[PDB]
Structure formats: structure tokens, C-alpha cells
PDB file of C-alpha atoms and ligand atoms in Angstrom:
ATOM      1  CA  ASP C   2      -5.795 -24.097 -19.077  1.00 21.39           C
ATOM      2  CA  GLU C   3      -3.001 -22.260 -17.669  1.00 20.10           C
ATOM      3  CA  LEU C   4      -3.451 -18.930 -19.426  1.00 17.99           C
ATOM      4  CA  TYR C   5      -6.955 -18.368 -18.267  1.00 18.24           C
ATOM      5  CA  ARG C   6      -6.275 -19.720 -15.036  1.00 15.57           C
ATOM      6  CA  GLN C   7      -3.473 -17.289 -14.478  1.00 17.26           C
ATOM      7  CA  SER C   8      -5.083 -14.449 -16.411  1.00 19.49           C
ATOM      8  CA  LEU C   9      -7.889 -14.312 -13.871  1.00 17.29           C
ATOM      9  CA  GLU C  10      -5.705 -14.059 -11.196  1.00 17.14           C
ATOM     10  CA  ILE C  11      -3.824 -11.487 -12.470  1.00 15.55           C
ATOM     11  CA  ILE C  12      -6.936  -9.344 -12.915  1.00 16.22           C
ATOM     12  CA  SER C  13      -9.053 -10.440 -10.588  1.00 17.02           C
ATOM     13  CA  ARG C  14      -6.378  -9.664  -7.545  1.00 15.15           C
ATOM     14  CA  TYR C  15      -5.756  -6.121  -9.883  1.00 15.44           C
ATOM     15  CA  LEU C  16      -9.437  -4.828  -9.793  1.00 15.65           C
ATOM     16  CA  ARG C  17      -9.854  -6.071  -5.963  1.00 12.98           C
ATOM     17  CA  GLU C  18      -6.420  -4.260  -4.745  1.00 12.40           C
ATOM     18  CA  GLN C  19      -7.771  -1.415  -6.877  1.00 13.55           C
ATOM     19  CA  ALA C  20     -11.709  -1.506  -5.337  1.00 12.91           C
ATOM     20  CA  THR C  21     -10.147  -1.638  -2.061  1.00 12.90           C
ATOM     21  CA  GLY C  22      -7.063  -0.167  -1.586  1.00 14.21           C
ATOM     22  CA  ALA C  23      -4.776  -3.803   0.124  1.00 16.92           C
ATOM     23  CA  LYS C  24      -3.085  -6.214  -1.296  1.00 16.69           C
ATOM     24  CA  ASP C  25      -3.801  -9.957  -1.148  1.00 21.13           C
ATOM     25  CA  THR C  26      -1.547 -11.720   1.127  1.00 18.79           C
ATOM     26  CA  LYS C  27      -2.262 -14.798  -0.690  1.00 15.94           C
ATOM     27  CA  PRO C  28       0.448 -16.563  -2.738  1.00 16.42           C
ATOM     28  CA  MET C  29      -0.647 -16.952  -6.284  1.00 14.83           C
ATOM     29  CA  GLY C  30      -1.444 -20.075  -7.857  1.00 16.20           C
ATOM     30  CA  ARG C  31       0.914 -21.975 -10.900  1.00 14.73           C
ATOM     31  CA  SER C  32       3.646 -19.728 -12.341  1.00 12.39           C
ATOM     32  CA  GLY C  33       3.366 -17.095  -8.905  1.00 13.31           C
ATOM     33  CA  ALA C  34       6.830 -15.759 -10.265  1.00 12.44           C
ATOM     34  CA  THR C  35       5.238 -14.292 -13.373  1.00 15.07           C
ATOM     35  CA  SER C  36       1.747 -13.940 -11.828  1.00 13.69           C
ATOM     36  CA  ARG C  37       2.775 -11.325  -9.297  1.00 16.57           C
ATOM     37  CA  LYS C  38       5.482  -9.243 -11.600  1.00 18.43           C
ATOM     38  CA  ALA C  39       2.243  -8.821 -14.200  1.00 16.70           C
ATOM     39  CA  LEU C  40       0.244  -7.331 -11.080  1.00 11.53           C
ATOM     40  CA  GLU C  41       3.131  -5.531 -10.522  1.00  9.85           C
ATOM     41  CA  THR C  42       3.309  -4.260 -13.930  1.00 11.00           C
ATOM     42  CA  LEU C  43      -0.706  -3.539 -14.203  1.00  9.30           C
ATOM     43  CA  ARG C  44       0.215  -1.109 -10.409  1.00  7.12           C
ATOM     44  CA  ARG C  45       2.635   0.728 -12.128  1.00  4.94           C
ATOM     45  CA  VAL C  46       1.368   1.201 -15.911  1.00  2.71           C
ATOM     46  CA  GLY C  47      -2.333   0.349 -15.082  1.00  2.00           C
ATOM     47  CA  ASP C  48      -2.792   3.819 -12.773  1.00  2.00           C
ATOM     48  CA  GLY C  49      -1.029   5.768 -15.270  1.00  2.00           C
ATOM     49  CA  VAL C  50      -3.325   5.135 -17.835  1.00  2.00           C
ATOM     50  CA  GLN C  51      -6.866   5.856 -15.406  1.00  2.00           C
ATOM     51  CA  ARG C  52      -4.666   9.288 -15.105  1.00  2.00           C
ATOM     52  CA  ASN C  53      -3.798   9.763 -18.370  1.00  2.00           C
ATOM     53  CA  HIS C  54      -7.716   9.310 -19.880  1.00  2.00           C
ATOM     54  CA  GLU C  55      -9.751  10.519 -16.888  1.00  2.00           C
ATOM     55  CA  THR C  56     -11.270  12.501 -18.795  1.00  2.00           C
ATOM     56  CA  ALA C  57     -12.810   9.693 -21.582  1.00  2.00           C
ATOM     57  CA  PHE C  58     -12.986   6.962 -18.599  1.00  2.00           C
ATOM     58  CA  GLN C  59     -15.409   9.337 -16.757  1.00  2.00           C
ATOM     59  CA  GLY C  60     -17.234   9.724 -20.007  1.00  2.00           C
ATOM     60  CA  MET C  61     -17.439   6.346 -20.969  1.00  2.00           C
ATOM     61  CA  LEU C  62     -18.548   5.340 -17.220  1.00  2.00           C
ATOM     62  CA  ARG C  63     -21.307   7.755 -17.267  1.00  2.00           C
ATOM     63  CA  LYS C  64     -22.795   6.456 -20.764  1.00  2.00           C
ATOM     64  CA  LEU C  65     -22.494   3.126 -19.459  1.00  2.00           C
ATOM     65  CA  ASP C  66     -24.910   4.067 -16.197  1.00  2.00           C
ATOM     66  CA  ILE C  67     -23.677   1.157 -13.848  1.00  2.00           C
ATOM     67  CA  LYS C  68     -26.141   0.590 -11.231  1.00  2.00           C
ATOM     68  CA  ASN C  69     -26.750  -3.004 -10.616  1.00  2.00           C
ATOM     69  CA  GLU C  70     -26.208  -6.754 -11.159  1.00  2.00           C
ATOM     70  CA  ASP C  71     -27.548  -6.491 -14.712  1.00  2.00           C
ATOM     71  CA  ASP C  72     -25.409  -3.528 -16.137  1.00  2.00           C
ATOM     72  CA  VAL C  73     -22.478  -5.098 -14.713  1.00  2.00           C
ATOM     73  CA  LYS C  74     -23.370  -8.663 -17.519  1.00  2.00           C
ATOM     74  CA  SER C  75     -23.960  -6.146 -20.280  1.00  2.00           C
ATOM     75  CA  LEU C  76     -20.832  -5.150 -20.182  1.00  2.00           C
ATOM     76  CA  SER C  77     -19.411  -8.026 -21.818  1.00  2.00           C
ATOM     77  CA  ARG C  78     -21.190  -7.321 -25.388  1.00  2.00           C
ATOM     78  CA  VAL C  79     -19.828  -4.179 -24.552  1.00  2.00           C
ATOM     79  CA  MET C  80     -16.125  -5.436 -24.243  1.00  2.00           C
ATOM     80  CA  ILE C  81     -16.365  -7.169 -27.068  1.00  2.00           C
ATOM     81  CA  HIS C  82     -17.412  -4.081 -29.643  1.00  2.00           C
ATOM     82  CA  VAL C  83     -15.009  -1.965 -28.689  1.00  2.00           C
ATOM     83  CA  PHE C  84     -11.841  -4.568 -27.394  1.00  2.00           C
ATOM     84  CA  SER C  85     -12.253  -7.408 -29.480  1.00  2.00           C
ATOM     85  CA  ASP C  86     -13.004  -5.856 -32.539  1.00  2.00           C
ATOM     86  CA  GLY C  87     -10.035  -3.766 -33.050  1.00  2.00           C
ATOM     87  CA  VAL C  88      -6.337  -4.443 -33.520  1.00  2.00           C
ATOM     88  CA  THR C  89      -4.579  -6.439 -30.978  1.00  2.00           C
ATOM     89  CA  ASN C  90      -1.403  -4.800 -28.658  1.00  2.00           C
ATOM     90  CA  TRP C  91      -0.242  -4.754 -25.190  1.00  2.00           C
ATOM     91  CA  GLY C  92      -1.266  -0.888 -25.017  1.00  2.00           C
ATOM     92  CA  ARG C  93      -4.968  -2.136 -25.770  1.00  2.00           C
ATOM     93  CA  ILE C  94      -4.808  -4.844 -23.297  1.00  2.00           C
ATOM     94  CA  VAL C  95      -4.006  -2.492 -20.340  1.00  2.00           C
ATOM     95  CA  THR C  96      -6.566  -0.128 -21.848  1.00  2.00           C
ATOM     96  CA  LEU C  97      -9.110  -2.707 -21.318  1.00  2.00           C
ATOM     97  CA  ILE C  98      -7.715  -4.185 -17.492  1.00  2.00           C
ATOM     98  CA  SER C  99      -7.779  -0.474 -16.630  1.00  2.00           C
ATOM     99  CA  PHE C 100     -10.925   0.750 -17.659  1.00  2.00           C
ATOM    100  CA  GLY C 101     -11.885  -2.730 -15.672  1.00  2.00           C
ATOM    101  CA  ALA C 102     -10.535  -1.503 -12.595  1.00  2.00           C
ATOM    102  CA  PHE C 103     -11.891   2.080 -13.080  1.00  2.00           C
ATOM    103  CA  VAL C 104     -15.263   0.066 -13.004  1.00  2.00           C
ATOM    104  CA  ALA C 105     -14.234  -1.785 -10.232  1.00  2.00           C
ATOM    105  CA  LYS C 106     -13.684   1.389  -8.267  1.00  2.00           C
ATOM    106  CA  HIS C 107     -17.112   2.443  -8.891  1.00  2.00           C
ATOM    107  CA  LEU C 108     -18.830  -0.727  -7.770  1.00  2.00           C
ATOM    108  CA  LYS C 109     -16.833  -0.267  -4.474  1.00  2.00           C
ATOM    109  CA  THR C 110     -18.441   3.356  -4.017  1.00  2.00           C
ATOM    110  CA  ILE C 111     -22.122   1.874  -5.173  1.00  2.00           C
ATOM    111  CA  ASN C 112     -21.458  -0.455  -2.691  1.00  2.00           C
ATOM    112  CA  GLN C 113     -21.759  -3.106  -4.910  1.00  2.00           C
ATOM    113  CA  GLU C 114     -19.024  -4.895  -4.210  1.00  2.00           C
ATOM    114  CA  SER C 115     -19.711  -8.054  -4.873  1.00  2.00           C
ATOM    115  CA  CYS C 116     -20.326  -7.488  -8.900  1.00  2.00           C
ATOM    116  CA  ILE C 117     -16.205  -7.249  -8.820  1.00  2.00           C
ATOM    117  CA  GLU C 118     -15.085 -10.511  -9.124  1.00  2.00           C
ATOM    118  CA  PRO C 119     -18.214 -11.463 -11.776  1.00  2.00           C
ATOM    119  CA  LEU C 120     -16.847  -8.482 -13.601  1.00  2.00           C
ATOM    120  CA  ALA C 121     -13.683  -9.646 -13.606  1.00  2.00           C
ATOM    121  CA  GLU C 122     -14.039 -13.231 -15.292  1.00  2.00           C
ATOM    122  CA  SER C 123     -16.105 -11.240 -17.617  1.00  2.00           C
ATOM    123  CA  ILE C 124     -13.080  -9.544 -18.611  1.00  2.00           C
ATOM    124  CA  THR C 125     -10.811 -12.457 -18.442  1.00  2.00           C
ATOM    125  CA  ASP C 126     -13.266 -14.686 -20.717  1.00  2.00           C
ATOM    126  CA  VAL C 127     -13.023 -11.355 -23.386  1.00  2.00           C
ATOM    127  CA  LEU C 128      -9.600 -11.600 -23.139  1.00  2.00           C
ATOM    128  CA  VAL C 129      -8.681 -14.960 -23.480  1.00  2.00           C
ATOM    129  CA  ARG C 130     -11.184 -16.663 -25.222  1.00  2.00           C
ATOM    130  CA  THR C 131     -10.819 -13.590 -28.342  1.00  2.00           C
ATOM    131  CA  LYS C 132      -7.178 -13.235 -28.514  1.00  2.00           C
ATOM    132  CA  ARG C 133      -5.567 -16.497 -27.232  1.00  2.00           C
ATOM    133  CA  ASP C 134      -3.727 -16.849 -30.653  1.00  2.00           C
ATOM    134  CA  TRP C 135      -2.414 -13.372 -29.972  1.00  2.00           C
ATOM    135  CA  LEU C 136      -1.087 -14.191 -25.990  1.00  2.00           C
ATOM    136  CA  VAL C 137      -0.033 -17.424 -26.714  1.00  2.00           C
ATOM    137  CA  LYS C 138       2.214 -15.554 -29.812  1.00  2.00           C
ATOM    138  CA  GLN C 139       3.507 -12.612 -27.872  1.00  2.00           C
ATOM    139  CA  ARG C 140       4.394 -14.466 -24.912  1.00  2.00           C
ATOM    140  CA  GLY C 141       1.508 -14.676 -22.654  1.00  2.00           C
ATOM    141  CA  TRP C 142       1.883 -13.176 -19.411  1.00  2.00           C
ATOM    142  CA  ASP C 143       5.487 -13.576 -19.163  1.00  2.00           C
ATOM    143  CA  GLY C 144       5.388 -11.331 -22.644  1.00  2.00           C
ATOM    144  CA  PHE C 145       3.304  -8.798 -21.149  1.00  2.00           C
ATOM    145  CA  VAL C 146       6.014  -8.033 -18.055  1.00  2.00           C
ATOM    146  CA  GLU C 147       9.167  -8.428 -20.241  1.00  2.00           C
ATOM    147  CA  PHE C 148       6.994  -6.092 -22.857  1.00  2.00           C
ATOM    148  CA  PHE C 149       6.978  -3.011 -20.196  1.00  2.00           C
ATOM    149  CA  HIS C 150       9.908  -4.393 -18.078  1.00  2.00           C
ATOM    150  CA  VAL C 151      11.958  -0.446 -17.727  1.00  2.00           C
ATOM    151  CA  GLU C 152      16.106  -1.377 -17.228  1.00  2.00           C
ATOM    152  CA  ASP C 153      17.851   0.534 -13.625  1.00  2.00           C
ATOM    153  CA  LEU C 154      18.638   3.991 -14.185  1.00  2.00           C
ATOM    154  CA  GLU C 155      22.783   4.168 -14.060  1.00  2.00           C
ATOM    155  CA  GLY C 156      23.912   6.845 -11.036  1.00  2.00           C
TER     156      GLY C 156
HETATM  157  C1  Q51 Y   1      -7.131   6.541 -26.912  1.00  2.00           C
HETATM  158  C2  Q51 Y   1      -7.602   5.378 -26.777  1.00  2.00           C
HETATM  159  C3  Q51 Y   1      -7.799   5.013 -25.064  1.00  2.00           C
HETATM  160  C4  Q51 Y   1      -6.207   4.955 -24.014  1.00  2.00           C
HETATM  161  C5  Q51 Y   1      -8.047   6.460 -24.281  1.00  2.00           C
HETATM  162  C6  Q51 Y   1      -9.932   6.852 -24.492  1.00  2.00           C
HETATM  163  C7  Q51 Y   1     -10.440   5.261 -24.659  1.00  2.00           C
HETATM  164  C8  Q51 Y   1     -12.322   5.289 -24.837  1.00  2.00           C
HETATM  165  O1  Q51 Y   1     -12.487   6.823 -24.695  1.00  2.00           O
HETATM  166  C9  Q51 Y   1     -13.124   4.648 -23.599  1.00  2.00           C
HETATM  167  C10 Q51 Y   1     -12.773   5.438 -22.790  1.00  2.00           C
HETATM  168  C11 Q51 Y   1     -12.766   3.981 -22.485  1.00  2.00           C
HETATM  169  C12 Q51 Y   1     -12.078   3.280 -23.641  1.00  2.00           C
HETATM  170  C13 Q51 Y   1     -12.965   1.962 -24.096  1.00  2.00           C
HETATM  171  N1  Q51 Y   1     -13.074   0.934 -23.794  1.00  2.00           N
HETATM  172  C14 Q51 Y   1     -13.535   0.201 -22.585  1.00  2.00           C
HETATM  173  C15 Q51 Y   1     -14.198  -1.627 -22.940  1.00  2.00           C
HETATM  174  C16 Q51 Y   1     -15.535  -0.625 -24.110  1.00  2.00           C
HETATM  175  C17 Q51 Y   1     -16.331   0.031 -22.122  1.00  2.00           C
HETATM  176  C18 Q51 Y   1     -16.755  -1.378 -22.128  1.00  2.00           C
HETATM  177  C19 Q51 Y   1     -15.229  -1.651 -21.166  1.00  2.00           C
HETATM  178  C20 Q51 Y   1     -15.815  -2.370 -19.894  1.00  2.00           C
HETATM  179  C21 Q51 Y   1     -14.703  -3.051 -19.353  1.00  2.00           C
HETATM  180 CL1  Q51 Y   1     -15.106  -3.615 -17.445  1.00  2.00          CL
HETATM  181  C22 Q51 Y   1     -13.046  -2.780 -19.747  1.00  2.00           C
HETATM  182  C23 Q51 Y   1     -13.495  -2.355 -20.963  1.00  2.00           C
HETATM  183  C24 Q51 Y   1     -14.140  -1.608 -21.296  1.00  2.00           C
HETATM  184  C25 Q51 Y   1     -13.348  -1.920 -23.600  1.00  2.00           C
HETATM  185  O2  Q51 Y   1     -12.033  -1.680 -23.596  1.00  2.00           O
HETATM  186  C26 Q51 Y   1     -11.201  -1.159 -23.979  1.00  2.00           C
HETATM  187  C27 Q51 Y   1      -9.877  -1.326 -24.676  1.00  2.00           C
HETATM  188  C28 Q51 Y   1      -9.756  -0.557 -25.422  1.00  2.00           C
HETATM  189  C29 Q51 Y   1      -9.504   0.840 -25.300  1.00  2.00           C
HETATM  190  C30 Q51 Y   1     -10.655   1.317 -25.188  1.00  2.00           C
HETATM  191  C31 Q51 Y   1     -11.543   0.725 -24.215  1.00  2.00           C
HETATM  192  C32 Q51 Y   1      -8.484   1.651 -26.559  1.00  2.00           C
HETATM  193  O3  Q51 Y   1      -7.967   1.465 -27.799  1.00  2.00           O
HETATM  194  N2  Q51 Y   1      -9.044   2.777 -26.294  1.00  2.00           N
HETATM  195  S1  Q51 Y   1      -7.789   3.829 -27.534  1.00  2.00           S
HETATM  196  O4  Q51 Y   1      -7.933   4.066 -28.629  1.00  2.00           O
HETATM  197  O5  Q51 Y   1      -6.556   3.364 -27.069  1.00  2.00           O
END
């Protein structure tokens, strides 16, 4: 399942890099050129989302009250409720992943870094297993990179 594997790599890398502040130097697996560009795109776009929606992000983080492994496990149901049960567009997928990064950083602050990879798996499961048809029609991560590509300015 190439789409699942690629999605997990991108999402896991972004969440870990957001939590630790360090770039992972290891090569990507299959489709590395696209996965690298997808991760680079998340750095640009996801970082903006967390700031543009800081107040709402903080508000939802407080409502969720994430203290431990069991709380983190319970997020799958909430993601299905809020993300899956709505229109699909790339913006909503970026909000899903960006709020994931926001939660990952919270897990770093409460010294529960071990839950970051399980969290990335849960986000990936919700995205890929509930939106595969849409992702395939939109050209997967190649389409993500194309959608957010910005042309160089003249001069
Ligand atoms: C204008 C809206 C956002 C850009 C800004 C604020 C949004 C909301 O107040 C909540 C702050 C987190 C937002 C709720 N969740 C976040 C949520 C749902 C809450 C739990 C959760 C946990 C993780 Cl690890 C990742 C995502 C999530 C599901 O993903 C979302 C995807 C799209 C939208 C909202 C999502 C989503 O579509 N949000 S929106 O209508 O575009």
C-alpha cells in the first residue's frame, strides 16, 4: 500500500520535526523526491496554519485535555467526527495534519514524546482509510505538492 506508507512517512516526519525542532537526516523510502517536496510543503503551509488559527487551536487543545496514552488513543474518534464527516479539500487535510503537529508539540512539553508516533499513525489511518478515493482522484502527494506550488517571482 504505497499511498499509506508514503502518507505515514510524511506525517510522522512532520510531527516529529515539529516536536523536536530537528530535521531527520535519513532518506525517504519509495517516491522520495515527492515525499521530500510534500514535507517541505507542510513546513511552509502547516506552520502558517498553526499561527493563523492559534486561538482556535489552543481552545481545542484545552477541550481535549491530553494527559496520557489513553487520551491520545481517543483522538481517532474525534478526527473521524470532525475531519472525515465533512467536505474534503487540501486545506482541510492541512488543518488535520497541522493540528496533529500542534498536539505533537504539546506531547513534547509534557514529556510524552513516545505517543507522537502512535498519533501520526492514527492521523494517517483516518486520512488514508477514509479519503482514499479522493486522494487518488487528486493525484495523491504529487497532487498535494502541485496544488501548493508557488512560482518564483520575477526580478
Ligand atoms: C476555519 C477552520 C480552521 C482552519 C481553524 C479552526 C478550526 C477548529 O476550531 C478546530 C481547531 C482544530 C480544529 C478541529 N479539527 C482538528 C481535528 C479534530 C480535533 C481532534 C484532532 C486531533 C488531531 Cl491529532 C488532528 C486533528 C484533529 C480534526 O482535523 C480537523 C480538520 C479540519 C478542520 C478542523 C479539524 C477544519 O475544516 N477546520 S476549518 O473549518 O477549516
